[model samples]
Target chain A: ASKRALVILAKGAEEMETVIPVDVMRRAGIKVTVAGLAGKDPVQCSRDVVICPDASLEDAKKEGPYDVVVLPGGNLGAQNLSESAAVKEILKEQENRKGLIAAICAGPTALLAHEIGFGSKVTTHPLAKDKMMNGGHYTYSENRVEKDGLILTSRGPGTSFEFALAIVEALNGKEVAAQVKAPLVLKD
Target chain B: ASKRALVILAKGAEEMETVIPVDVMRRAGIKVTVAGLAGKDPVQCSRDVVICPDASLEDAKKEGPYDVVVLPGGNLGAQNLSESAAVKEILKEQENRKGLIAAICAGPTALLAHEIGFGSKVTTHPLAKDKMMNGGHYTYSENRVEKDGLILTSRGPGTSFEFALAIVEALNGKEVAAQVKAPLVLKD
Candidate 1:
């Protein structure tokens, strides 16, 4: 069966980070749901790009047990994600189920906020390091993409492709990831 | 004065290509208008990511004389661009004004279709090479990002950052591009 992934899209989300994973995962044949955090309305991203979500987070959560849940970052977007009680519930459940939870840039900070992946080695945008390490709950790394067990994290917009490809490898395996990566003409 | 860009967004446009440049350009403080080719409706991209355009092409065209006009690529999106009489006029006017006209992946194919920028060197997704060379109107290069005179072209998804940075360099100069690229944590 094809894998299913959920991407939470909040107002002020990083459009590049959000789109890259969603697009790349689909290329790997993963059913990706771009769920808007603010009801079913279009999301206005950090750079002002407006994206119409596939469904509302309220609606998407009902169809859960997703193979992976993705979080894309912008400061405000991450803040919104970090504050949501619904998001906290979703992450906690995914953690309990041992499902993959991926985040990039400031997205990983939400993990810190929700207390979802304590003690896992993680990374976030350089600017977000202080907030992510506030209590030093998780170890930090400078790797562009870091996968510590079921939790995967990456840096900023420039690393989005790598982050997305890593998620593909996790869900669909390296062979499928390589096949999807080739057409993208990615750098080594 | 801030530089303004018009990005033509069409159904089946590669969402990565569309969002990356728009986001990156905005990071460089460029005012980017993501205009829809099919009126004000949301554009469903090649990977099924739906993007809401800021304005319809008809409305945007009237407000143009932008510093740059960007074309993003997906096979069907480029095909739509290639077939549009409106797009032909936009490209021609931009070319006549000697404005920077940038395209990526299959996007340059639209330039060929409109007979814009003949004799300039260009590049596209490797898979798009044959079509771009249909009549040999423009010289082709294997460079990931190719800028010949006022026409700028790039390969696929992986090269989007480089493509966008080049556009930034063209409009905002090297210093601003470098400043913007830093926070992105881009690979050297």
Candidate 2:
């Protein structure tokens, strides 16, 4: 069976962070579900790009046990994720199942807010460092992409490709990751 | 006054390429209009990401004489762009006015199709090279991002940020481009 991924999409999400991972993962042949946090309506991202989700979070949650739960970050999007009890439960269940949890930019703040990966090392957008480390729940690293156990985190939109490729490698292995990467014409 | 950009969005457009530049330009305070080529409906991109355009291309044309005109790439998306008479007219007008025109990945092929920017040095996704240079009408380069006068071109998904920053530099100057680039936390 193919690996499944659940990407939680919310208003004010970083369009780059959200789309890059979704596109990259799809290219890697993952079954990706872009679930709307609010409803199945179009979401207006931080830069005002509107994206239509595959399913509402409520609907997608019913089809869960995804191989990975991915979070994409913008200040308000992360805030929305952090405030959602639904997201909290999903993260907790994924953690319980020992499935991967990938986030990028300010996204790790949601993990901190939900108390999901407290003891793991993490990384976030430089601007998000203070907010993510406010409680010192997770040790921080400056790597562009950091994977400490099952919690995968990466920096801003600039590091999104690396973040997404990391997720692909985790679920599909290095060969598949490399195969998908070549056509992207990545400089590094 | 803030610079305005017109980004043509079509079905099968590379969602990552389309969103990354739009988000980056928006970060630089560019007023970017994501106009749908088909209509105002949501477009299903190459990797299944759905994007709702800000307006119809027909409508966007009326508000033109923009600072820059951007074309994002996916093979089918570029093919649609290449076949459009409306796109040909727009490119002709932009060229007549000596306005900046940018295309990435397979997008530069649209320039070749419409006979826009002839003789300008350009670059495209490696797979797109033969198509872009089918008749050797234009000179080619292997640079990740290449610019010759009013025409700017870039390779693929991974070079999008560099391509976008070049547009920012062209429209707003190096200082603005540098300021916008710093926060992105780009490696190298």
Candidate 3:
């Protein structure tokens, strides 16, 4: 059976963060759902790129229990995720089920907002470190991609490929992840 | 005035290659146009990410000549670009005006198809080397990003940030590119 992923897309989501993981996972043969948080309309990303989601969040959650739930980061986008009661419920459920939950850059702040992973070692974009560490709910690391058990987090756009590949490794396995990485011509 | 860029979006284009450069260039304050080749409708990329282009190619062409014209790659997308008379016109005009012409992954193959930038040193995704060198018109490079005069080419998704930042440096200057690069948290 194929592993499934849910990527919640909000108004200010970072398009690269959202797209990289979704594309990489698909290459790994994972079924990824790009769900729009603000209903079914196209999302206006922080950089002004408009992405039309596969399904609305309301509808996508009903089909849930996905292998991983992804949150992409933009300062405003993370704020949108943090403020949503609907998002709150989704994260809580995913955590309760012991499913993988991932975020990047400012995306990790939303995890703090929902109080999903307390004391889990994590990382966020350098500028977002203070916000993510405010209440000391999680220990911070400088690794580009940081994973402590089921809660995975990474830094910013430059680290996006690593972030996506980490997700691939978690769901599909290292061999599958390496196969997907080779063709990308990544320099690291 | 800010530098302007034209990114021609074709069906089956690699969404990661397409979105990364667009978003990064915009961060450097370049005015980038995501132009749809077939018309102004949404473009379904290789991995099925739908991007709503900012304008139709027909409409965007009238605003030329842009500082740089970008091509994103997917085998099928490059095939589409390789087959387009409209793209031939765009690249040819950009070359005639001595403006920058950029492509990535299989995108450089379109240059071969269109018969533009024949003698420049260039690079493409490793998989695309044979097709790009069929006639040996241009020199092949293994650099993550290659620039010979106004022709810039790169490998694949993993090199997108370097490719995009190179474009930013070309049009906006090194300081601006560096400023933009800082927040991206790029590892390499």
Candidate 4:
């Protein structure tokens, strides 16, 4: 079966964070759905990266049991994510059901607000570290990638590769990630 | 007058680094020309980000002088860029004229190959700093966004915002850069 990943979007989310992962996943043959926190319409990304959602948070709440839930970080994206009760519910489900729960940069701050990061190892954008530290044990790496259980997380834009590689590993295994890395000739 | 920027597209270039900056710049009302260094046709990005260029490197060089020249760092992208004589000519010309010469991640390696970093402070993908050491002084920061005169550069993907923001400031001034940053709410 094809794997599905859920991405939560709101006002002020980083465009690169959201678009990069989505594009990578698609290229890797994973199906992705953009779940807007506000509604099913188009939303603005940070620095004017405008994107329309595949579904609304309200509708997405009813649609899954999904394989993964991903969040892209930005200044207000985390704060805005915290306000969505639907996102909180999804987090609860992912934690309890062993589904992949991931966030990047400030997006992980939402996990702190939801309190799901307790006893977990999470990494986020440097600025979001304080909140990640407050919520749980945060590991810092310039490498920009890390994984703990079903929870996958990364630093900021720099970590995008590790983040995408982690997702590829989770869904397609190490060999596929290796294949993806081969063309780029990356050392790690 | 709208400023024009040259975007380099080569195999293995970081998908996010290349796309995000181009996307953001277009949104900011800057004219971007994706220059394919590998002869004719579209250049495929790392993880399959295909960008059809407005002109080939030979053609773009013929046009003469762009306001800014952007290089997105990826293992292959840098390797290919450094190997291209046409691209090197453009970089040299831009450097001579004090036009904006920007790069990210391994992208800085190309700048280094052209000896653009002899006495300048620049950043690149974290892993390649040792490789970059021979070219110039390297400074590491959570966000490696720095501009010394016509040369604007940033660390890798994590610092893409700094990269984009720096471009905005250089081309459009602080007020326009502020406008881009204000709504995006990107973390420091």
Candidate 5:
């Protein structure tokens, strides 16, 4: 099977969080399928950045097992993705199947809602700090990215590079991730 | 006439620097035309995010003589935008016309190439310090955003919020900028 990643694209999604990782992973030779919460037509990001998903949520469910499920963060997107029974089922099954579960920015809110952040140290956009702190024991830091086991979280749009790097590291190993980081010259 | 800003989209573009300002400015009632080096369709940013632009370089030229030229930084993107003759011409003219010229991260490379950096107090993406130091007589700072005359510059993606605020300050004054900043609760 292809190295698969399911990127959740929903209404009011943070465009960068959704598109950045998908672009990075595809460039690194991973196949990405953007799964939309609603219809398969174009979805509008916060500020008129229109994006079309590769598949609908129903289609993604029918595709059966993916290697990873990625949730891009935003207030509305996190709430919607987390509240989706279909998506929650996918997350549970994927984890049971030992698949990677990644979320960025406010996306970890979904994990928190799913009770996945109980012991996992996570980070998110500063705006969501209260939610994260209240929901779970999260190790806060200035760094843009934080990883705990199979789950990953980041500090919003600014951390997109490091967040994408983390995903790359998860899939293709540290060497390749380092190579991408070196060229991008992202500071620690 | 529509309020205009130049957005440089290229490989390795900073996620926040490109999107946040584009977003906030649009929200603040400004029109932004993304001037991409790539042809039609999506331009891949760092970590493989594909951002579709408002226009291509050719298209930007046809509709140019804009009010502000905004540059989003990336090592490769800055290099490309800096080296482009057309981009240089626009910067040169915008400076002469007393229009706004803003750049963040490696975005300042374009300004530098057009000889706008001489004697100008500027800031850029963290990786640009060495380059700016080597360029010539440049007054550099670590400020998130700096405004010296009509030229406004900022640090990389993290400072996008500040950069957008600076743009608001430039166009509508500090009072209006503050009004917008309050909602986001963005700090220096």
Candidate 6:
């Protein structure tokens, strides 16, 4: 069975964080979907790099039961995710289904907002720590990528590749992860 | 004066490679323009990530004398660059003026195609080595990022940050590169 990933793309998303994981996952043979948070229009990222998503989140959610759901982070992008009822439903569904839920940078803060995966060890961009720990519902780690059960979290843009490789390992196993990581010319 | 960069975005460009440099350079306080190779429209990347360029390469060339001209890579994207008469002129003008010209992965192959910076030390994605070495006109390196005078080249997506930082060092200075690097949470 092919592993399917849903990457929810929002306006102001960190373009690098969004693109790195999506590209790496595809390299690992994952069927990754870039879904627009709004309608099926092009998204303007934090640095003004625009991305056109494959489908609207409205349309993508209907093709559910994805193996993993990825959330990319930028301050405003995470805020939008935190506030979306649609996002809350998706996260909760993934949580209930025990599917992998990955978030990076300010992205993990949205898990706090959605009340998904409470008590799991997590991490976020240092600047986003206070927000992610608003109620101390989750133990925090300074590790670049933290995976506790089905919930995976990581820090900022610099850790995107590590974060993505973690997701690949979680779903496709270490062999696939290593195969994907090698050609990327990444330093350990 | 703030340094300026022109990133040529083409159909089938590696989205991660394209976005990382553009975003990281912006973080370094370099003014970057993502120029479309075909026209002022959305570019479909190799991984199917669609990117909307800021302007057409035709329009951007008129505003030249930029501090750096960046070429991102995907086989088809580099082929497009290799085949572009406009790109040849741009590289020639930049080279004649002694300005910096940077390329990543298969991007350096375009320099070979355009006959720019021959005999310079450079690097490319390992898979691109053969094409880059086709004429034995340039020296090759396996280093993650290689810089020889005004020519800067890097490996692949994983080396993008280092590649961008090198460009920053060239145009700004080590201090600026270090300052910019710290916030990116990069592992040394």
Best candidate, lDDT-wise?
Answer: 1
lDDT of 5 by residue, A101-172 (tens): 888888988876776646777777777888877744666654567777777878776566678878888888
Can you write out model 4's per-residue Cα lDDT over B1-188, one digit (the tens) per residue? 88998887887777678767876687678887777787557566665544455677777777657899999887888999898887788888888888899988788888777777466776666677788776345544434677766777777665676788789788988888777664443434
lDDT of 2 by residue, B1-188 (tens): 88999999998889888998899899899999999998998999999999999999999999978999999999999999999999999999999999999999999999999999999999999999999998899999999999999999999999999999999999999999999998788997
Candidate 4 error regions (>4 Å): A135-143, A184-187, B1-18, B23-66, B69-188
Model 1 clash pairs are: none
Residue pairs of candidate 2 with colliding backbone atoms = none
DockQ (model 2, Cα) = 0.93
Per-residue lDDT of model 6, residues B1-188, tens digit only: 88899999989899888999999899888899999999999999998889999999999999877999999999999999999999999999999999999999989999999999999999999999999999899999999999998999999989999998899899989999999888678888
Find the number of clashing residue pairs for candidate 2: 0
lDDT tens string, model 4, A28-48?
788778788989766776655
Interface DockQ per candidate:
0.94, 0.93, 0.94, 0.12, 0.18, 0.86
Sort every candidate by DockQ, greatest first. 1, 3, 2, 6, 5, 4
Interface RMSD of 2: 0.6
Q: Which residue pairs in model 3 clash with each other?
A: none
Candidate 4 docks with a DockQ of 0.12
> Candidate 4: global Cα-lDDT?
0.75
In candidate 3, what are the lDDT values of residues B1-188, reduced to their tens digit?
87899999999999999999999999988899999999999999999999999999999999988999999999999999999999999999999999999999999999999999889999999889999999889999999999998899999988889999999999999999999999898875
lDDT of 6 by residue, A1-188 (tens): 99999999999899999999999999888999999999899999999899999999999999988999999999999999999999999999999889999999999999999999999999999999999998889999999899999989999899999999999999999999999998889989
lDDT for each residue of candidate 1 in A48-138, tens digit (9 for 90 to 100): 9999999999999999889999999999999999999999999999999999999999999999999998999999999999999998899
Chain A TM-score values, per prediction? 0.99, 0.99, 0.99, 0.91, 0.90, 0.99
After superposition, candidate 1 runs with Cα above 4 Å error: none
Worst 10 residues of 5 chain B by lDDT: B179-188
Assess every candidate by TM-score: 0.99, 0.99, 0.99, 0.58, 0.69, 0.98
**Comparison by TM-score, 2 against 5, better one:** 2
Worst 10 residues of 6 chain A by lDDT: A179-188
**Candidate 6, superposed: residue stretches over 4 Å from native:** none
Better of 1 and 5 by TM-score: 1
- The pairs that clash in candidate 6 are none
